[PDB]
Design a binder for these strands. Structure first.
Ligand SMILES: [Mg+2]
Ligand SMILES: [Mg+2]
Ligand SMILES: [Mg+2]
Ligand SMILES: [Mg+2]
Ligand SMILES: [Mg+2]
Ligand SMILES: [Mg+2]
Ligand SMILES: [Mg+2]
Ligand SMILES: [Mg+2]
Ligand SMILES: [Mg+2]
Ligand SMILES: [Mg+2]
Ligand SMILES: [Mg+2]
Ligand SMILES: [Mg+2]
Ligand SMILES: [Mg+2]
Ligand SMILES: [Mg+2]
Ligand SMILES: [Mg+2]
Ligand SMILES: [Mg+2]
Ligand SMILES: [Mg+2]
Ligand SMILES: [Mg+2]
Ligand SMILES: [Mg+2]
Ligand SMILES: [Mg+2]
Ligand SMILES: [Mg+2]
Ligand SMILES: [Mg+2]
Ligand SMILES: [Mg+2]
Ligand SMILES: [Mg+2]
Ligand SMILES: [Mg+2]
Ligand SMILES: [Mg+2]
Ligand SMILES: [Mg+2]
Ligand SMILES: [Mg+2]
Ligand SMILES: [Mg+2]
Ligand SMILES: [Mg+2]
Ligand SMILES: [Mg+2]
Ligand SMILES: [Mg+2]
Ligand SMILES: [Mg+2]
Ligand SMILES: [Mg+2]
Ligand SMILES: [Mg+2]
Ligand SMILES: [Mg+2]
Ligand SMILES: [Mg+2]
Ligand SMILES: [Mg+2]
Ligand SMILES: [Mg+2]
Ligand SMILES: [Mg+2]
Ligand SMILES: [Mg+2]
Ligand SMILES: [Mg+2]
Ligand SMILES: [Mg+2]
Ligand SMILES: [Mg+2]
Ligand SMILES: [Mg+2]
Ligand SMILES: [Mg+2]
Ligand SMILES: [Mg+2]
Ligand SMILES: [Mg+2]
Ligand SMILES: [Mg+2]
Ligand SMILES: [Mg+2]
Ligand SMILES: [Mg+2]
Ligand SMILES: [Mg+2]
Ligand SMILES: [Mg+2]
Ligand SMILES: [Mg+2]
Ligand SMILES: [Mg+2]
Ligand SMILES: [Mg+2]
Ligand SMILES: [Mg+2]
Ligand SMILES: [Mg+2]
Ligand SMILES: [Mg+2]
Ligand SMILES: [Mg+2]
Ligand SMILES: [Mg+2]
Ligand SMILES: [Mg+2]
Ligand SMILES: [Mg+2]
Ligand SMILES: [Mg+2]
Ligand SMILES: [Mg+2]
Ligand SMILES: [Mg+2]
Ligand SMILES: [Mg+2]
Ligand SMILES: [Mg+2]
Ligand SMILES: [Mg+2]
Ligand SMILES: [Mg+2]
Ligand SMILES: [Mg+2]
Ligand SMILES: [Mg+2]
Ligand SMILES: [Mg+2]
Ligand SMILES: [Mg+2]
Ligand SMILES: [Mg+2]
Ligand SMILES: [Mg+2]
Ligand SMILES: [Mg+2]
Ligand SMILES: [Mg+2]
Ligand SMILES: [Mg+2]
Ligand SMILES: [Mg+2]
Ligand SMILES: [Mg+2]
Ligand SMILES: [Mg+2]
Ligand SMILES: [Mg+2]
Ligand code: NA
Lengths: 14, 271, 46, 93
RNA sequence: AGGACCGAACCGACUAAUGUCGAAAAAUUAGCGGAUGACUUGUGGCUGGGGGUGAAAGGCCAAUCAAACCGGGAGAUAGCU
RNA sequence: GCUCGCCGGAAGACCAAGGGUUCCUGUCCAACGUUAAUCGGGGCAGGGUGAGUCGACCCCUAAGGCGAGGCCGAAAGGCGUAGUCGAUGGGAAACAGGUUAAUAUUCCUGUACUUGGUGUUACUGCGAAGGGGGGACGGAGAAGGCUAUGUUGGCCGGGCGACGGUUGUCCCGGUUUAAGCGUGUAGGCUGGUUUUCCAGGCAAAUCCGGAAAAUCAAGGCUGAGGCGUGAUGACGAGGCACUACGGUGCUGAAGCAACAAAUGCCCUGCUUCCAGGAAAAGCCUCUAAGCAUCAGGUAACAUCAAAUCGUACCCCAAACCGACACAGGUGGUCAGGUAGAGAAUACCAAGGCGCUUGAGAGAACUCGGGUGAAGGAACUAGGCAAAAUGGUGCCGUAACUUCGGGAGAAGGCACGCUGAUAUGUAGGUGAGGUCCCUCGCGGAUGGAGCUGAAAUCAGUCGAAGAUACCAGCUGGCUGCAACUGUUUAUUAAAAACACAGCACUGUGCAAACACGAAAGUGGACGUAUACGGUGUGACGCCUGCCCGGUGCCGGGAGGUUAAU
């Protein structure tokens, strides 16, 4: 493709 | 008259209007009108060069006779008119030869008053003549800086210049700012103060009132990010800087006047 | 959802048309590059 | 005065169709495929000169060519001009 | 009269649910705010990258923004995988 | 084809933008269409877009662009004058009916109109890159007059009914007609006319502006709509015949009135307010040079011309922007009935659709809803969600307040239908008639007819009458922000930003300041009651002490100190 969506943010292991 | 609006709504509670019943409630004199398009504060290059300008009411330009060089011919004031381009009101004035002109309206001017310009005019208010035939100590307005240039000082509402001294080819003037300035005695000035001295008593009440005068909102430099202003940044209302302009120059007292070619004419600067 | 491409033939030709390209020195270098590349459609002019 | 060499270029063909047949039938209008330039005055002069009939008025329209897909290639037929020539009273000749 | 009030169009986007390989790369449904104004909208125009514009969030500038995109320097450099 | 359902301020109709043949006909069903497809916006072929009046083009200009020279700049180039482009604005003119499978204000029929050219005739001052007028302009509000339109009645044609009744104050349908031309109205604006004179309109001016005098008091300009004509025409419910049974042809009655009524028109009006509201041309007028026999102008009549390009089709959409036949987005115009305040809402009309997989079954669970014993926030972070409130009229309404508010505070009562008051009232409209006239679209009286709330009293039905849809929950204390507004397009709408107000400060105009190697431009065609910057942030009461540090302002004696 030409558009790759940003992956969903990870769980904030903070 | 200075009228306080009644608080029938917020934005109306604090309005104070300057309502003059003597102004013409009609269309202005069309031959003395021309187009005056807004700039938005944008210059030749299309860039905002002066900030906080934009919008406001459409307004036509009234050609006001500042030169006042129709000498000898008497003129009668036929109208006092609202001018969107000034804080002062204008006077539509008819000359004996059948010519109409707009002038600044002096303080006590009325419809039917006789004004005339020239070296031999009386010392009536509204009369224009070189500041060599005007007494010393007299209060004048629409003062020329150069002979024939037109008249650039004391043109705002309620403003006036005081002829303080007179030494040869020059006359010393106390300006509305408190500055003493030398001006050629062949420069014309109109007698009296500019009318509409209640203009500074208006309050505008609300933000839309300033918006329809063409004034766009002012963001404080503190309210910005460090990339936008020399102020700006901080974890909640931090300043710690000396106050400066958006371009880093100290405001809050730092003289920016640099002429060196007009210093000879400034007897004493304002205080 | 209004999208980014809102077509207008007048604005298209005034913005990227042949005469718009020819107006400037740099637009004429766009045409030279597209001529050197062999582009069938030189500008947005049809 | 349009020259005869130009009049002999103005007209290309008669347009045969049901609408053209009906026009000649019940309105005395002949339908022609004419040149692309083909002003109304040129068409009128050419019909009156070559067909030697009496022309009342000429209505013209441009027919845009159809995009056809011959094989696997995209082609376009040429635009052509169509003229509705109304003959005055007598008849075609 | 009014940056007045209630409330459609219109402009928004507060709550919840759904949806989350969606009908949709930002929605739908039910409610919600403004609704003569600092309003909204059409057409055209102008401002441009350390630049613009910003009722100011580092917001926006073609689904891209703490320095757009395209091409080039360019096979940058990479004691790292 | 008959039913059913859905939209109907659209899911109907017409456009612009954008698209570009998707339009219509025939044919085909591979692929495409989320299934089948005989169908299609698919394939193939053919057809289809007709203009003096619609639009573009054209004339004119806005923002803005370009820009001879010019000014500026290493070059590139920047700005800009004359000028020339640039619509989203100004500028001539066409309507109704009919017709195609597909276009129609373009074709046809009928009836118009406009601008030019060329002639003829007649009478004459014409003449501009120039002057003047005009074009020509805001918001809000109110009213009157109208119309579109609708309702009812009358009229005309048809009917007399599948289940009781239905020859009647019964049912169904129709009852249309334009531009143009004439009239000049409701209404708005304006005093006219003549003479003389003038330092103004870059020169002139007979025009405009100004002044004086006389004279008459009316004239002039604008103007919806109505009326007449257009039109013994067209259309027309239906009826009559034939089949391609799709339609084709023929004929054709009545074709009136009253009432209601726009957000449309008069109206670019009027009133009012401040925030004080394009330009230029067309147009009218005036003259200059110039030509005055000519040219030119004016007016009739005649003739000629009005080119070119667009016109199909979609256009809240399967045809545009979203990769899709995608629950998204997309400017304008038209907008009927019953109820309703309404463009809400419900049900309908015209019109258009049933959303391109169906058939079953009737588990959990999910989604979207309905109802629920007793309880009633015990839930939960939190009444999240839901439930609830909800209309109109009237009564009544606290603290506090900036005197406006709070407030729709809170609460409460009435509400359907029928009859009477009153064979429909108050009101509105308004015919005939009868006068009056300075006679017409006139005035006064007059009230037929039409329309018609609201209320009271009496009765009456239901569990319930604001019965559906629609449609505030309310109150108490408190922090923050005065308030309306703005913001992280796409997890933050906030106490953040803005704000009116306040203060400090700079700035004397070639202003400060900003964009620019510069020219120049903005500030501003402004001038200290102005403009910029900064902070604070309505209002009320206020804003105390510190100048040591850093900054800024002033001084300049002395010390130190660059190039030279
Ligand atoms: Mg400012
Ligand atoms: Mg401020
Ligand atoms: Mg601020
Ligand atoms: Mg902040
Ligand atoms: Mg911030
Ligand atoms: Mg900094
Ligand atoms: Mg800060
Ligand atoms: Mg901060
Ligand atoms: Mg802190
Ligand atoms: Mg600190
Ligand atoms: Mg563009
Ligand atoms: Mg014709
Ligand atoms: Mg044509
Ligand atoms: Mg409001
Ligand atoms: Mg909305
Ligand atoms: Mg927003
Ligand atoms: Mg929200
Ligand atoms: Mg509100
Ligand atoms: Mg509201
Ligand atoms: Mg735009
Ligand atoms: Mg931050
Ligand atoms: Mg983006
Ligand atoms: Mg960088
Ligand atoms: Mg790159
Ligand atoms: Mg290298
Ligand atoms: Mg590499
Ligand atoms: Mg095709
Ligand atoms: Mg089709
Ligand atoms: Mg077919
Ligand atoms: Mg098959
Ligand atoms: Mg299939
Ligand atoms: Mg097809
Ligand atoms: Mg311009
Ligand atoms: Mg230029
Ligand atoms: Mg040059
Ligand atoms: Mg032009
Ligand atoms: Mg236009
Ligand atoms: Mg054009
Ligand atoms: Mg059609
Ligand atoms: Mg001249
Ligand atoms: Mg009517
Ligand atoms: Mg009618
Ligand atoms: Mg009837
Ligand atoms: Mg019968
Ligand atoms: Mg029976
Ligand atoms: Mg009248
Ligand atoms: Mg309205
Ligand atoms: Mg002649
Ligand atoms: Mg004549
Ligand atoms: Mg069409
Ligand atoms: Mg169609
Ligand atoms: Mg589908
Ligand atoms: Mg769609
Ligand atoms: Mg409604
Ligand atoms: Mg509705
Ligand atoms: Mg179930
Ligand atoms: Mg329930
Ligand atoms: Mg229960
Ligand atoms: Mg029960
Ligand atoms: Mg119970
Ligand atoms: Mg309880
Ligand atoms: Mg609990
Ligand atoms: Mg618990
Ligand atoms: Mg919880
Ligand atoms: Mg809730
Ligand atoms: Mg609920
Ligand atoms: Mg009436
Ligand atoms: Mg009840
Ligand atoms: Mg509600
Ligand atoms: Mg607390
Ligand atoms: Mg507080
Ligand atoms: Mg707030
Ligand atoms: Mg508001
Ligand atoms: Mg915004
Ligand atoms: Mg967000
Ligand atoms: Mg967020
Ligand atoms: Mg949010
Ligand atoms: Mg904020
Ligand atoms: Mg603050
Ligand atoms: Mg505060
Ligand atoms: Mg203090
Ligand atoms: Mg000290
Ligand atoms: Mg010092
Ligand atoms: Na100090």
């Amino acid at each position: 493709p030409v558009y790759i969506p940003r992956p969903r943010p990870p769980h904030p292991r903070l | 008259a200075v009228v306080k609006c009644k608080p029938t709504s917020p934005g109306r509670r604090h309005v104070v209007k300057v309502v003059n019943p003597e102004l013409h409630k009609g269309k202005p004199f069309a031959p003395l009108l021309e187009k005056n398009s807004k700039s938005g504060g944008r210059n030749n290059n299309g860039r905002i060069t002066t900030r906080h300008i934009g919008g406001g009411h459409k307004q036509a330009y009234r050609i006001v006779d500042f030169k006042r060089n129709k000498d000898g011919i008497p003129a009668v004031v036929e109208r006092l008119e609202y001018d969107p381009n000034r804080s002062a009101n204008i006077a539509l004035v008819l000359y004996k030869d059948g010519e109409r002109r707009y002038i600044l309206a002096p303080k006590g001017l009325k419809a039917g008053d006789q004004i005339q310009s020239g070296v031999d005019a009386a010392i009536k208010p509204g009369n224009t003549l070189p500041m060599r035939n005007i007494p010393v100590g007299s209060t004048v307005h629409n003062v020329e800086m150069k002979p024939g240039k037109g008249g650039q000082l004391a043109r705002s509402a309620g403003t006036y210049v005081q002829i303080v001294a007179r030494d040869g080819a020059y006359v010393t003037l106390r300006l509305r700012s408190g500055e003493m300035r030398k001006v050629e005695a062949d420069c014309r000035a109109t007698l009296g103060e500019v009318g509409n001295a209640e203009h500074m008593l208006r309050v505008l009440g609300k933000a839309g009132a300033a918006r329809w005068r063409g004034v766009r909102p002012t963001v404080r430099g503190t309210a910005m990010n460090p990339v936008d202003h020399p102020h700006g940044g901080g974890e909640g209302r931090n300043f710690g800087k000396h106050p400066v302009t958006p371009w880093g120059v100290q405001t809050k007292g730092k003289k920016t006047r640099s002429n060196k070619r007009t210093d000879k004419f400034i007897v004493r600067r304002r205080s | 959802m209004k999208r980014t491409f809102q077509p207008s033939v007048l604005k298209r030709n005034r913005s990227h048309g042949f005469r718009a390209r020819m107006a400037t020195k740099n637009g004429r270098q766009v045409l030279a590059r597209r001529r050197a590349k062999g582009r069938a459609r030189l500008t947005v002019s049809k | 005065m349009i020259r005869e060499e130009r009049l002999l270029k103005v007209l290309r063909a008669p347009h045969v169709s049901e609408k053209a047949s009906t026009a000649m039938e019940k309105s005395n209008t002949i339908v022609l495929k004419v040149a692309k330039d083909a002003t109304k005055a040129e068409i009128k002069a050419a019909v009156q000169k070559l067909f030697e009939v009496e022309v009342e008025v000429v209505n013209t329209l441009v027919v845009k060519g159809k995009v056809k897909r011959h094989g696997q290639r995209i082609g376009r037929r040429s635009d052509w001009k169509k003229a509705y020539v109304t003959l005055k009273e007598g008849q075609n000749l």
